[PDB]
mmCIF file of C-alpha atoms and ligand atoms in Angstrom:
data_model
loop_
_atom_site.group_PDB
_atom_site.id
_atom_site.type_symbol
_atom_site.label_atom_id
_atom_site.label_comp_id
_atom_site.label_asym_id
_atom_site.label_seq_id
_atom_site.Cartn_x
_atom_site.Cartn_y
_atom_site.Cartn_z
ATOM 1 C CA UNK A 1 71.408 35.278 22.652
ATOM 2 C CA UNK A 2 73.317 35.442 19.376
ATOM 3 C CA UNK A 3 70.060 34.939 17.406
ATOM 4 C CA UNK A 4 68.976 38.405 19.001
ATOM 5 C CA UNK A 5 72.199 40.466 18.178
ATOM 6 C CA UNK A 6 71.870 43.094 15.534
ATOM 7 C CA UNK A 7 68.057 42.552 15.290
ATOM 8 C CA UNK A 8 67.258 46.382 15.290
ATOM 9 C CA UNK A 9 67.405 48.530 12.139
ATOM 10 C CA UNK A 10 66.482 52.164 11.492
ATOM 11 C CA UNK A 11 67.330 55.452 9.916
ATOM 12 C CA UNK A 12 68.643 58.422 11.856
ATOM 13 C CA UNK A 13 65.982 60.304 13.724
ATOM 14 C CA UNK A 14 63.230 57.865 12.643
ATOM 15 C CA UNK A 15 63.553 55.250 15.495
ATOM 16 C CA UNK A 16 64.681 51.731 15.824
ATOM 17 C CA UNK A 17 62.510 48.815 14.726
ATOM 18 C CA UNK A 18 62.364 45.044 15.082
ATOM 19 C CA UNK A 19 60.899 42.498 12.799
ATOM 20 C CA UNK A 20 57.714 40.925 14.205
ATOM 21 C CA UNK A 21 55.057 38.499 12.773
ATOM 22 C CA UNK A 22 51.363 38.645 13.483
ATOM 23 C CA UNK A 23 48.569 36.164 12.693
ATOM 24 C CA UNK A 24 48.294 32.721 11.095
ATOM 25 C CA UNK A 25 49.858 32.399 8.686
ATOM 26 C CA UNK A 26 52.690 34.768 9.836
ATOM 27 C CA UNK A 27 52.474 38.366 8.581
ATOM 28 C CA UNK A 28 55.925 39.887 8.706
ATOM 29 C CA UNK A 29 55.975 43.615 9.834
ATOM 30 C CA UNK A 30 58.545 46.091 11.087
ATOM 31 C CA UNK A 31 57.788 47.578 14.279
ATOM 32 C CA UNK A 32 59.151 50.574 16.065
ATOM 33 C CA UNK A 33 60.579 49.839 19.484
ATOM 34 C CA UNK A 34 59.090 52.395 22.158
ATOM 35 C CA UNK A 35 59.887 52.396 25.797
ATOM 36 C CA UNK A 36 57.764 55.458 26.241
ATOM 37 C CA UNK A 37 54.420 53.949 25.514
ATOM 38 C CA UNK A 38 52.476 50.662 26.268
ATOM 39 C CA UNK A 39 50.418 49.994 23.084
ATOM 40 C CA UNK A 40 51.039 47.375 20.487
ATOM 41 C CA UNK A 41 49.587 49.173 17.392
ATOM 42 C CA UNK A 42 50.153 48.298 13.635
ATOM 43 C CA UNK A 43 48.928 49.856 10.381
ATOM 44 C CA UNK A 44 45.948 47.795 9.213
ATOM 45 C CA UNK A 45 45.039 49.918 6.027
ATOM 46 C CA UNK A 46 46.860 50.704 2.726
ATOM 47 C CA UNK A 47 48.156 54.080 4.010
ATOM 48 C CA UNK A 48 50.545 55.435 1.117
ATOM 49 C CA UNK A 49 53.458 55.705 3.395
ATOM 50 C CA UNK A 50 53.421 52.130 4.354
ATOM 51 C CA UNK A 51 55.453 49.133 2.764
ATOM 52 C CA UNK A 52 53.031 46.648 4.257
ATOM 53 C CA UNK A 53 50.324 46.390 6.819
ATOM 54 C CA UNK A 54 48.454 44.144 9.118
ATOM 55 C CA UNK A 55 45.657 42.348 7.110
ATOM 56 C CA UNK A 56 43.320 40.846 9.675
ATOM 57 C CA UNK A 57 41.148 39.003 7.036
ATOM 58 C CA UNK A 58 44.042 36.741 6.331
ATOM 59 C CA UNK A 59 44.335 35.556 9.964
ATOM 60 C CA UNK A 60 42.352 32.573 11.478
ATOM 61 C CA UNK A 61 43.678 33.395 14.798
ATOM 62 C CA UNK A 62 42.498 36.835 14.997
ATOM 63 C CA UNK A 63 39.738 37.771 17.422
ATOM 64 C CA UNK A 64 37.798 41.165 17.542
ATOM 65 C CA UNK A 65 37.437 43.020 20.783
ATOM 66 C CA UNK A 66 34.550 45.249 19.695
ATOM 67 C CA UNK A 67 36.069 48.428 20.985
ATOM 68 C CA UNK A 68 37.888 51.439 19.564
ATOM 69 C CA UNK A 69 41.127 53.207 20.647
ATOM 70 C CA UNK A 70 42.037 56.829 20.085
ATOM 71 C CA UNK A 71 45.679 58.050 20.850
ATOM 72 C CA UNK A 72 46.137 61.830 20.253
ATOM 73 C CA UNK A 73 49.510 63.513 20.266
ATOM 74 C CA UNK A 74 50.563 67.289 20.118
ATOM 75 C CA UNK A 75 51.644 66.566 16.595
ATOM 76 C CA UNK A 76 48.697 64.399 15.380
ATOM 77 C CA UNK A 77 47.198 61.028 16.393
ATOM 78 C CA UNK A 78 46.198 57.479 15.566
ATOM 79 C CA UNK A 79 43.000 55.550 15.941
ATOM 80 C CA UNK A 80 42.193 51.957 15.675
ATOM 81 C CA UNK A 81 40.329 48.713 16.468
ATOM 82 C CA UNK A 82 41.252 46.488 19.273
ATOM 83 C CA UNK A 83 41.700 42.813 18.953
ATOM 84 C CA UNK A 84 44.104 39.855 19.734
ATOM 85 C CA UNK A 85 46.261 37.574 17.713
ATOM 86 C CA UNK A 86 49.323 35.478 17.647
ATOM 87 C CA UNK A 87 52.542 37.403 17.796
ATOM 88 C CA UNK A 88 56.250 36.134 17.274
ATOM 89 C CA UNK A 89 59.614 37.808 17.116
ATOM 90 C CA UNK A 90 61.754 36.043 14.366
ATOM 91 C CA UNK A 91 65.082 37.221 15.853
ATOM 92 C CA UNK A 92 63.743 36.940 19.488
ATOM 93 C CA UNK A 93 62.835 33.970 21.607
ATOM 94 C CA UNK A 94 61.265 30.885 20.033
ATOM 95 C CA UNK A 95 57.658 31.499 21.471
ATOM 96 C CA UNK A 96 54.333 32.678 20.183
ATOM 97 C CA UNK A 97 51.890 34.675 22.287
ATOM 98 C CA UNK A 98 48.328 36.045 22.171
ATOM 99 C CA UNK A 99 48.812 39.778 22.481
ATOM 100 C CA UNK A 100 46.462 42.706 22.288
ATOM 101 C CA UNK A 101 46.714 44.418 18.961
ATOM 102 C CA UNK A 102 45.449 47.915 17.893
ATOM 103 C CA UNK A 103 44.743 47.920 14.112
ATOM 104 C CA UNK A 104 45.312 51.315 13.080
ATOM 105 C CA UNK A 105 42.681 52.651 10.656
ATOM 106 C CA UNK A 106 43.263 56.451 10.810
ATOM 107 C CA UNK A 107 46.371 58.453 11.463
ATOM 108 C CA UNK A 108 47.674 61.956 11.417
ATOM 109 C CA UNK A 109 51.330 62.657 11.366
ATOM 110 C CA UNK A 110 52.119 59.216 12.818
ATOM 111 C CA UNK A 111 53.770 57.321 10.022
ATOM 112 C CA UNK A 112 56.935 58.807 8.458
ATOM 113 C CA UNK A 113 57.081 58.948 4.545
ATOM 114 C CA UNK A 114 60.341 57.150 3.691
ATOM 115 C CA UNK A 115 60.479 55.026 6.928
ATOM 116 C CA UNK A 116 60.495 51.329 6.821
ATOM 117 C CA UNK A 117 58.396 50.559 9.845
ATOM 118 C CA UNK A 118 54.554 50.108 10.158
ATOM 119 C CA UNK A 119 53.708 49.844 13.789
ATOM 120 C CA UNK A 120 54.689 50.592 17.274
ATOM 121 C CA UNK A 121 55.677 48.153 20.069
ATOM 122 C CA UNK A 122 54.864 49.933 23.409
ATOM 123 C CA UNK A 123 57.249 48.506 25.889
ATOM 124 C CA UNK A 124 56.206 50.220 29.078
ATOM 125 C CA UNK A 125 53.545 49.318 31.606
ATOM 126 C CA UNK A 126 49.759 48.966 31.798
ATOM 127 C CA UNK A 127 49.218 52.272 33.582
ATOM 128 C CA UNK A 128 49.614 54.384 30.480
ATOM 129 C CA UNK A 129 48.047 52.042 28.036
ATOM 130 C CA UNK A 130 45.120 53.149 26.082
ATOM 131 C CA UNK A 131 42.249 53.207 26.403
ATOM 132 C CA UNK A 132 43.053 52.058 30.083
ATOM 133 C CA UNK A 133 45.202 49.905 32.243
ATOM 134 C CA UNK A 134 43.275 46.730 31.559
ATOM 135 C CA UNK A 135 44.620 46.526 28.114
ATOM 136 C CA UNK A 136 47.526 44.256 28.840
ATOM 137 C CA UNK A 137 50.708 45.391 27.164
ATOM 138 C CA UNK A 138 52.719 43.244 24.890
ATOM 139 C CA UNK A 139 55.520 42.262 27.163
ATOM 140 C CA UNK A 140 53.170 41.502 30.170
ATOM 141 C CA UNK A 141 51.397 38.794 27.852
ATOM 142 C CA UNK A 142 54.924 37.515 26.878
ATOM 143 C CA UNK A 143 55.870 36.951 30.563
ATOM 144 C CA UNK A 144 52.592 35.608 31.618
ATOM 145 C CA UNK A 145 52.347 33.071 28.868
ATOM 146 C CA UNK A 146 55.839 31.806 28.402
ATOM 147 C CA UNK A 147 58.924 31.103 30.608
ATOM 148 C CA UNK A 148 60.683 34.162 29.265
ATOM 149 C CA UNK A 149 62.107 36.146 32.106
ATOM 150 C CA UNK A 150 60.733 39.520 33.008
ATOM 151 C CA UNK A 151 63.387 41.855 31.578
ATOM 152 C CA UNK A 152 64.781 43.075 28.251
ATOM 153 C CA UNK A 153 67.782 45.250 27.062
ATOM 154 C CA UNK A 154 68.556 47.561 24.320
ATOM 155 C CA UNK A 155 71.708 48.450 22.502
ATOM 156 C CA UNK A 156 71.150 51.226 20.110
ATOM 157 C CA UNK A 157 74.122 51.983 17.914
ATOM 158 C CA UNK A 158 73.760 55.283 15.956
ATOM 159 C CA UNK A 159 71.561 54.069 8.552
ATOM 160 C CA UNK A 160 71.202 52.705 12.185
ATOM 161 C CA UNK A 161 71.356 49.268 13.699
ATOM 162 C CA UNK A 162 71.064 47.690 17.183
ATOM 163 C CA UNK A 163 69.995 44.876 19.495
ATOM 164 C CA UNK A 164 66.974 44.046 21.530
ATOM 165 C CA UNK A 165 67.815 41.150 23.865
ATOM 166 C CA UNK A 166 64.263 39.823 25.010
ATOM 167 C CA UNK A 167 64.440 37.766 28.214
ATOM 168 C CA UNK A 168 67.965 38.640 29.184
ATOM 169 C CA UNK A 169 71.372 40.265 28.976
ATOM 170 C CA UNK A 170 74.289 39.599 26.566
ATOM 171 C CA UNK A 171 77.548 40.602 28.071
ATOM 172 C CA UNK A 172 79.339 40.977 24.769
ATOM 173 C CA UNK A 173 77.236 44.071 24.100
ATOM 174 C CA UNK A 174 78.876 46.113 27.023
ATOM 175 C CA UNK A 175 82.143 46.762 28.729
ATOM 176 C CA UNK A 176 82.661 47.439 32.431
ATOM 177 C CA UNK A 177 79.965 47.050 34.940
ATOM 178 C CA UNK A 178 76.089 47.466 34.852
ATOM 179 C CA UNK A 179 74.902 50.099 37.277
ATOM 180 C CA UNK A 180 71.195 50.111 38.364
ATOM 181 C CA UNK A 181 68.696 53.026 39.076
ATOM 182 C CA UNK A 182 65.294 52.138 40.533
ATOM 183 C CA UNK A 183 62.166 52.256 38.561
ATOM 184 C CA UNK A 184 60.275 54.941 40.685
ATOM 185 C CA UNK A 185 56.839 53.915 39.449
ATOM 186 C CA UNK A 186 55.682 51.218 37.020
ATOM 187 C CA UNK A 187 54.045 53.401 34.302
ATOM 188 C CA UNK A 188 56.796 54.967 32.048
ATOM 189 C CA UNK A 189 60.313 53.670 32.883
ATOM 190 C CA UNK A 190 60.672 56.488 35.370
ATOM 191 C CA UNK A 191 64.004 57.166 37.190
ATOM 192 C CA UNK A 192 65.314 59.890 39.412
ATOM 193 C CA UNK A 193 68.221 62.254 38.309
ATOM 194 C CA UNK A 194 70.045 63.713 41.425
ATOM 195 C CA UNK A 195 72.886 65.745 39.947
ATOM 196 C CA UNK A 196 73.915 67.209 36.625
ATOM 197 C CA UNK A 197 77.411 68.305 35.645
ATOM 198 C CA UNK A 198 78.598 70.108 32.480
ATOM 199 C CA UNK A 199 82.321 69.124 31.827
ATOM 200 C CA UNK A 200 82.892 68.765 35.696
ATOM 201 C CA UNK A 201 80.648 71.563 37.091
ATOM 202 C CA UNK A 202 77.448 71.361 38.932
ATOM 203 C CA UNK A 203 74.345 73.158 37.730
ATOM 204 C CA UNK A 204 73.624 73.773 41.384
ATOM 205 C CA UNK A 205 69.887 73.375 40.871
ATOM 206 C CA UNK A 206 67.458 72.013 43.386
ATOM 207 C CA UNK A 207 67.508 68.371 42.154
ATOM 208 C CA UNK A 208 63.643 68.366 42.291
ATOM 209 C CA UNK A 209 63.700 70.123 39.145
ATOM 210 C CA UNK A 210 65.871 67.749 36.990
ATOM 211 C CA UNK A 211 62.769 65.514 37.517
ATOM 212 C CA UNK A 212 60.079 68.345 37.282
ATOM 213 C CA UNK A 213 57.122 66.257 36.352
ATOM 214 C CA UNK A 214 59.291 63.158 35.853
ATOM 215 C CA UNK A 215 62.346 61.608 34.176
ATOM 216 C CA UNK A 216 62.113 58.778 31.785
ATOM 217 C CA UNK A 217 64.045 56.477 29.664
ATOM 218 C CA UNK A 218 62.363 56.506 26.062
ATOM 219 C CA UNK A 219 63.781 54.796 22.969
ATOM 220 C CA UNK A 220 60.918 56.255 20.893
ATOM 221 C CA UNK A 221 62.224 59.863 21.279
ATOM 222 C CA UNK A 222 65.450 61.151 19.532
ATOM 223 C CA UNK A 223 66.652 63.915 21.709
ATOM 224 C CA UNK A 224 67.684 64.399 25.349
ATOM 225 C CA UNK A 225 64.859 66.500 26.709
ATOM 226 C CA UNK A 226 65.088 68.548 29.775
ATOM 227 C CA UNK A 227 62.617 70.494 31.861
ATOM 228 C CA UNK A 228 62.435 74.254 30.926
ATOM 229 C CA UNK A 229 64.413 75.756 33.907
ATOM 230 C CA UNK A 230 66.939 72.948 33.615
ATOM 231 C CA UNK A 231 67.408 73.373 29.852
ATOM 232 C CA UNK A 232 67.837 77.009 30.335
ATOM 233 C CA UNK A 233 70.671 76.502 32.795
ATOM 234 C CA UNK A 234 72.179 73.618 30.953
ATOM 235 C CA UNK A 235 72.481 75.642 27.640
ATOM 236 C CA UNK A 236 73.697 78.672 29.411
ATOM 237 C CA UNK A 237 76.517 76.479 30.796
ATOM 238 C CA UNK A 238 77.344 74.660 27.573
ATOM 239 C CA UNK A 239 77.470 78.044 25.837
ATOM 240 C CA UNK A 240 80.066 79.363 28.412
ATOM 241 C CA UNK A 241 82.067 76.134 27.940
ATOM 242 C CA UNK A 242 82.216 76.671 24.283
ATOM 243 C CA UNK A 243 81.923 80.415 23.587
ATOM 244 C CA UNK A 244 85.032 80.149 21.530
ATOM 245 C CA UNK A 245 82.764 80.217 18.360
ATOM 246 C CA UNK A 246 76.604 80.737 17.157
ATOM 247 C CA UNK A 247 72.933 82.050 16.625
ATOM 248 C CA UNK A 248 70.285 81.917 19.364
ATOM 249 C CA UNK A 249 68.024 79.733 17.243
ATOM 250 C CA UNK A 250 70.579 76.909 17.071
ATOM 251 C CA UNK A 251 70.157 76.247 20.739
ATOM 252 C CA UNK A 252 66.240 76.239 20.477
ATOM 253 C CA UNK A 253 66.412 73.825 17.621
ATOM 254 C CA UNK A 254 65.264 76.324 15.054
ATOM 255 C CA UNK A 255 68.275 76.072 12.786
ATOM 256 C CA UNK A 256 71.221 73.860 12.032
ATOM 257 C CA UNK A 257 75.067 74.882 12.240
ATOM 258 C CA UNK A 258 78.103 73.777 10.073
ATOM 259 C CA UNK A 259 81.794 73.586 9.849
ATOM 260 C CA UNK A 260 85.919 70.340 16.316
ATOM 261 C CA UNK A 261 84.657 68.370 19.349
ATOM 262 C CA UNK A 262 86.823 69.577 22.175
ATOM 263 C CA UNK A 263 85.240 73.013 22.770
ATOM 264 C CA UNK A 264 82.071 71.052 23.760
ATOM 265 C CA UNK A 265 81.662 69.773 27.251
ATOM 266 C CA UNK A 266 80.736 66.206 28.331
ATOM 267 C CA UNK A 267 77.422 65.932 30.143
ATOM 268 C CA UNK A 268 76.983 63.940 33.259
ATOM 269 C CA UNK A 269 73.761 62.536 34.867
ATOM 270 C CA UNK A 270 74.115 61.181 38.324
ATOM 271 C CA UNK A 271 71.182 58.637 38.805
ATOM 272 C CA UNK A 272 69.737 57.428 42.165
ATOM 273 C CA UNK A 273 71.465 53.989 42.953
ATOM 274 C CA UNK A 274 70.305 50.868 44.550
ATOM 275 C CA UNK A 275 71.692 51.836 48.072
ATOM 276 C CA UNK A 276 70.704 54.635 50.408
ATOM 277 C CA UNK A 277 72.647 57.730 49.685
ATOM 278 C CA UNK A 278 74.502 56.028 46.872
ATOM 279 C CA UNK A 279 74.402 57.230 43.201
ATOM 280 C CA UNK A 280 76.277 56.634 39.856
ATOM 281 C CA UNK A 281 76.884 58.776 36.953
ATOM 282 C CA UNK A 282 76.426 58.413 33.144
ATOM 283 C CA UNK A 283 78.588 60.664 30.934
ATOM 284 C CA UNK A 284 77.699 61.630 27.378
ATOM 285 C CA UNK A 285 80.123 62.858 24.767
ATOM 286 C CA UNK A 286 79.092 65.802 22.504
ATOM 287 C CA UNK A 287 79.179 63.171 19.609
ATOM 288 C CA UNK A 288 75.630 62.235 21.112
ATOM 289 C CA UNK A 289 73.974 65.821 21.608
ATOM 290 C CA UNK A 290 75.234 67.046 18.289
ATOM 291 C CA UNK A 291 73.557 64.871 15.687
ATOM 292 C CA UNK A 292 74.503 64.832 11.986
ATOM 293 C CA UNK A 293 71.645 65.707 9.511
ATOM 294 C CA UNK A 294 79.093 68.662 8.168
ATOM 295 C CA UNK A 295 75.820 70.216 9.541
ATOM 296 C CA UNK A 296 74.775 69.232 13.039
ATOM 297 C CA UNK A 297 71.421 69.736 14.933
ATOM 298 C CA UNK A 298 71.524 70.470 18.628
ATOM 299 C CA UNK A 299 69.931 67.337 19.974
ATOM 300 C CA UNK A 300 69.013 68.627 23.337
ATOM 301 C CA UNK A 301 65.615 70.359 23.918
ATOM 302 C CA UNK A 302 63.243 71.807 26.450
ATOM 303 C CA UNK A 303 60.200 69.898 27.694
ATOM 304 C CA UNK A 304 56.954 70.356 29.461
ATOM 305 C CA UNK A 305 56.609 66.651 30.184
ATOM 306 C CA UNK A 306 59.908 66.205 32.200
ATOM 307 C CA UNK A 307 63.319 64.773 31.439
ATOM 308 C CA UNK A 308 63.411 62.401 28.527
ATOM 309 C CA UNK A 309 66.492 60.298 28.064
ATOM 310 C CA UNK A 310 66.004 59.525 24.408
ATOM 311 C CA UNK A 311 67.944 57.562 21.887
ATOM 312 C CA UNK A 312 70.704 60.382 21.951
ATOM 313 C CA UNK A 313 71.358 59.324 25.464
ATOM 314 C CA UNK A 314 70.808 55.605 25.071
ATOM 315 C CA UNK A 315 73.004 55.124 21.978
ATOM 316 C CA UNK A 316 76.137 55.340 24.182
ATOM 317 C CA UNK A 317 74.884 52.617 26.602
ATOM 318 C CA UNK A 318 73.666 49.181 26.984
ATOM 319 C CA UNK A 319 70.353 49.656 28.859
ATOM 320 C CA UNK A 320 68.847 46.912 30.833
ATOM 321 C CA UNK A 321 65.018 47.158 31.588
ATOM 322 C CA UNK A 322 64.813 44.908 34.510
ATOM 323 C CA UNK A 323 61.247 44.638 35.159
ATOM 324 C CA UNK A 324 61.442 41.773 37.703
ATOM 325 C CA UNK A 325 63.615 43.827 40.130
ATOM 326 C CA UNK A 326 62.051 47.243 39.300
ATOM 327 C CA UNK A 327 65.379 48.627 38.142
ATOM 328 C CA UNK A 328 67.103 50.025 35.076
ATOM 329 C CA UNK A 329 71.014 49.300 34.398
ATOM 330 C CA UNK A 330 73.454 51.076 32.524
ATOM 331 C CA UNK A 331 76.780 50.095 31.103
ATOM 332 C CA UNK A 332 79.280 51.406 28.356
ATOM 333 C CA UNK A 333 78.080 50.097 25.060
ATOM 334 C CA UNK A 334 80.510 48.057 22.922
ATOM 335 C CA UNK A 335 79.400 50.034 19.969
ATOM 336 C CA UNK A 336 79.598 53.771 21.113
ATOM 337 C CA UNK A 337 87.133 61.074 26.058
ATOM 338 C CA UNK A 338 84.957 57.978 26.130
ATOM 339 C CA UNK A 339 81.326 57.340 27.259
ATOM 340 C CA UNK A 340 81.293 56.329 30.922
ATOM 341 C CA UNK A 341 79.340 54.698 33.777
ATOM 342 C CA UNK A 342 81.088 55.216 37.109
ATOM 343 C CA UNK A 343 80.271 54.732 40.865
ATOM 344 C CA UNK A 344 79.641 54.659 43.594
ATOM 345 C CA UNK A 345 79.010 58.232 44.618
ATOM 346 C CA UNK A 346 77.721 59.754 47.958
ATOM 347 C CA UNK A 347 74.520 61.687 47.292
ATOM 348 C CA UNK A 348 72.317 62.669 50.305
ATOM 349 C CA UNK A 349 68.471 63.385 50.263
ATOM 350 C CA UNK A 350 68.054 61.702 46.811
ATOM 351 C CA UNK A 351 64.318 60.996 47.520
ATOM 352 C CA UNK A 352 63.778 64.850 47.683
ATOM 353 C CA UNK A 353 64.638 64.910 43.929
ATOM 354 C CA UNK A 354 61.370 63.159 43.087
ATOM 355 C CA UNK A 355 58.403 65.536 42.210
ATOM 356 C CA UNK A 356 55.180 64.567 43.817
ATOM 357 C CA UNK A 357 51.675 64.499 42.390
HETATM 358 C C1 AEH B 401 60.431 58.140 15.269
HETATM 359 C C2 AEH B 401 59.089 59.095 15.360
HETATM 360 C C3 AEH B 401 57.865 58.661 16.194
HETATM 361 C C4 AEH B 401 58.040 58.287 17.517
HETATM 362 C C5 AEH B 401 56.851 57.831 18.095
HETATM 363 C C6 AEH B 401 57.058 57.446 19.642
HETATM 364 C C7 AEH B 401 56.260 58.457 20.513
HETATM 365 N N1 AEH B 401 55.678 57.583 21.639
HETATM 366 C C8 AEH B 401 55.713 57.606 17.435
HETATM 367 C C9 AEH B 401 55.661 57.881 16.050
HETATM 368 C C10 AEH B 401 56.686 58.401 15.460
HETATM 369 O O1 AEH B 401 56.605 58.722 13.959
#
């Protein structure tokens, strides 16, 4: 998979993107890699913020689906026209597939001024695809139409660079062993967190709440995001671990702080393992949750949507999205006190940590 190593670029806080080609002849576009959504959507109009965009008129292979799509966010939104066309990944596998495409014609606060990407590759499952689950996501089309195996992996190295290995795993990208957590349900990449430690001390919370709503692995989000009750407990504990030196706003992400690592505790997430009563842990260094903007932003934040293991978390690990076996694997990244994946551990009643509809 040497063709696929170092195929991700980006800028700090602005996500990771892969080069893709759409239509015939091939239109080259940079596309944000997002494991937290399921739509393939590209700018299709000369928005001022964009370097290039999908020009459908230039494509003989384009087919209109005569239906619109509206994806609102808290921040803003995007809106487009659904169609299908030929898609390739230059630094990916030598195949071409007919995928669904959402041609973005109106957006608000979606594109970033100064970024170098023009679309989003939603890598999650049909269940959360818009308008509904019959809009087959990109990766599904890829698996269905080629011999490419049903899995991919990401190494995000924190401007930024990384690797998306489509159809497999490259062992030169991690050290130690891969450890696997089950995908709880195929919609987002939903996993179950069963224990949290700060430095070495348990938060002693009912584990149901580490997953309140849900917990997900999402390369489109920057921060480590935690449910409100959890974040509260987590911050109070990181405070106590480093009360050697800060304003209340710094923790809420309302202001930066400037200057020194060792006063800051490591963070451990134990994740449900493959075997009954067995877990494993991932450990993140404060080099991950204190992001340079020497002024740092606190890259942990509260959430109303559950835990989000964003790029902050993923940047220390090689993460295997093993769709075929409904699991996600973690190993120490070859590009990351040192970040760690260890096991096995004994954890009882792990199923109770899942929150139910
Ligand atoms: C990097 C910031 C960013 C992230 C996402 C992913 C959200 N599912 C979408 C648009 C955007 O500008």
